[PDB]
Swiss-Prot record:
GO terms for molecular function: aspartic-type endopeptidase activity. This is Endothiapepsin. The active site is at D35, S199. The gene is EAPA. The chain holds residues 90 to 419 of 419 of the full protein. Residues 17-328 form the Peptidase A1 domain. Belongs to the peptidase A1 family.
Length: 330
């Protein structure tokens, strides 16, 4: 079997992408943020404290004929931005674009941090990293992809994110019409539980390609591209007036500037991020300063190929026994 769902940017900046997911019987549709940087499927629910719910669609397991409390199990997660959520665990039928999984652990949020409360468009997260990162205790749970692998035609899922436009998450097949040329596959290290890989280098605009190993994670759940300070400083030195701001917390540039492209290597292939993708608009309404799409990973400890990088390519997450990441131009 296969699955295919449209993902849509939540705002005019592509801050996040939401995909409709059906949970329970009769189905309850929730718009979840597909995150390849985490492994928990958690949703806002009838158990979440009323003051922390601000317009999200909630999951109500008492109205689902297939819901079962996963007795004793609890979860607790914290993300890279400082946000967090916790609660109890239910099992239910979960379907993504026609692909159905029965007995999927759905983590019901009891408490959510203010960052999630203010994002009314996002009803929860659907983790797509390796199951070793799942926070359900004492019995660690499997992600939706891991549970679905048994039914899929091929143990792959693809991400085809759009620039200020809807995109597609496919499960179990590769759409040869979504990309140009061929797909370049690179090795994945599952050691930290992430889709970790090594980029063969970078170029700034029309400059020469610098062959250097950049280890990082393919993360659909992170908006920006976080790279080593040496790479970031070389990109932003090509934009007049660009500077790292402490009050903002990162590189900013004059909104009047034209940003160069950024190329990253995948084996012998090159993936070009156009300059426009690196522009995140004014820091505040009417501002003359614009927020940059490429930021330093120095304070994070890990390089993250987030949505800015992934949306420039058709990305294959091959979850076979030896996992690989495939990238193609689109």
């Amino acid at each position: 079997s296969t699955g295919s769902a449209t993902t849509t940017p939540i705002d005019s900046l592509d801050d996040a992408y939401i995909t409709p997911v059906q949970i329970g019987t009769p189905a309850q549709t929730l718009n979840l943020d597909f995150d390849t940087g985490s492994s928990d499927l958690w949703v806002f629910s009838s158990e979440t404290t009323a003051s922390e719910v601000d317009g999200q669609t909630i999951y109500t397991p008492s109205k689902s004929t297939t819901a079962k409390l996963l007795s004793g199990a609890t979860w607790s997660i914290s993300y890279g931005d400082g946000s967090s959520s916790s609660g109890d665990v239910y099992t239910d039928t979960v379907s993504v674009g026609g692909l159905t999984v029965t007995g999927q652990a759905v983590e019901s949020a009891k408490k959510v941090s203010s960052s999630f409360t203010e994002d009314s468009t996002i009803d929860g997260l659907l983790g797509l990293a390796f199951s070793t990162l799942n926070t359900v205790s004492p019995t660690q749970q499997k992600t939706f992809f891991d549970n679905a692998k048994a039914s899929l035609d091929s143990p792959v899922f693809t991400a085809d994110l759009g620039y200020h436009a809807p995109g597609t998450y496919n499960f179990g097949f590769i759409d040869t019409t979504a990309y140009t040329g061929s797909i370049t596959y690179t090795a994945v290290s599952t050691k930290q539980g992430f889709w970790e890989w090594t980029s063969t280098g970078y170029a700034v605009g029309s400059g020469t390609f610098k062959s250097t190993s950049i280890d990082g994670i393919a993360d659909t759940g992170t908006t920006l591209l976080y790279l080593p300070a040496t790479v970031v400083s070389a990109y932003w030195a090509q934009v007049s007036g660009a500077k790292s701001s402490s009050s903002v917390g990162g590189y900013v540039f004059p909104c009047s500037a034209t940003l160069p492209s950024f190329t990253f290597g995948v084996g012998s292939a090159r993936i070009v991020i156009p300059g426009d993708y690196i522009d995140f608009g004014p820091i505040s309404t009417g501002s003359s300063s614009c927020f940059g799409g490429i930021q330093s990973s120095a304070g994070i400890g890990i390089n993250i190929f987030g949505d800015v990088a992934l949306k420039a390519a058709f990305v294959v997450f091959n979850g076979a026994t030896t996992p690989t990441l495939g990238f193609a131009s689109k």
